[PDB]
Structure formats: C-alpha cells, structure tokens
C-alpha cells in the first residue's frame, strides 16, 4: 500500500539472546522486481549507541546483537531504506520503533 | 505508492484473553477498515479494527483446525470516504 507504519517491535529487557537475535522482516515488495539493499539508520543502528540493530541487506531481516537494559534508552527509532542499484531509494524511507519492555 | 510490506502477526492458538484482545496497530483524517475473511467475510468478527487508531484485536480463542492462517487488507479513506492510499495486505499465524 501507498504508506503505512510498521508495527511497533517489543523486545525483552536483558534478554539472554542468543545473540545476534533476529527481531522482525523489513522489506519491499519492489524487491521482486528490482534487486534492492536494505539499511537501517537512526540512534541503535548507525547513530549512537551504534551496533546495537543491524539489518540484512538481501532479507531485510532486523536482528539485535546484545541484552539491553531500559535505563539509558527504553525505545529506539529507526529508519529501513530501500535502493536500486545506483544507490537511489526506490521507497520512501520507513519507521521502526522498537520498545524494550520489562 | 509504497510497497513496504507488514511483517506477519503471530497469535497463540486458544489464548485466554480477555476479549477482545490487542494484536497490533495499523495506521498510515483518516478512517480505517478491514477486509477478508475473518473481518467482514466469514467466519465474520472475528478481526475488528478501530476505524480511528488502526488498532486490529481479536474478538475470541481461535483453534487452528478450520483456518490456521488469515489474509486480511487494510483500508483507508479521508473523511469524505475517498482512499487515500492502497490497501494493505495483513497476515495472520494462528501458532501452536
Ligand atoms: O533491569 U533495568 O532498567
């Protein structure tokens, strides 16, 4: 559809993993058609703490790499991207939210 | 438009509840609906969204012998009724 949020993603608090732990799939149906490289930015991902989210660039599938504690940072606000082959994006960038919860 | 795709919604099977109980939010004002079966095509009611939020439950147990998987598509329109944007496909697992 035309734009959309995905649903917010909840996560344990100090989960014991293992790790990395695959969270949820962030993708475009484009990419059936074209050949597309997924990325995620925002605090978590490229932004500090950076590391903590990582997305694969083929699948889309998010995964965390690390327990987390909610005391610094209870949610995190990410952005997935999706581009051709030249490096432009072929979707609007989407949100995700991801809650660590206790 | 976009074609970014909704990740799959994982319901146990038989839960306890209570009814109706939270599943996820769906949103892009706006008015919001659901179709398919299992919305308004049968077995009906059993998916509800709230027209306002977005926010999709469930309205009772469901045992995964008659239909174990749901496709669903998400509407919505302004407030004269005009789509604003393509629908968009829900999946739902009922897991065991
Ligand atoms: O375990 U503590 O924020």
Request: glycine share 8%; no cysteine; proline share 11%.
């Given at each position: ?15 014991r ?7 949820v ?30 997305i ?8 965390v790499?690390?327990?987390?504690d ?20 072929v ?12």
């Amino acid at each position: 559809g035309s734009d959309w949020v995905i649903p917010p993603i909840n996560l344990p608090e100090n989960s014991r993993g293992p790790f990395p732990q695959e969270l949820v799939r962030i993708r475009s149906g484009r990419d059936k058609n074209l050949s597309l490289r997924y990325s995620v930015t925002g605090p978590g991902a490229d932004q500090p703490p950076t590391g903590i989210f990582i997305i694969n660039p083929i699948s889309g599938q998010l995964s965390v790499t690390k327990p987390l504690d909610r005391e610094l940072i209870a949610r995190f606000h990410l952005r997935a991207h999706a581009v051709d082959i030249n490096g432009n994006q072929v979707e609007n960038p989407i949100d995700i939210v991801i809650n660590v919860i206790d």
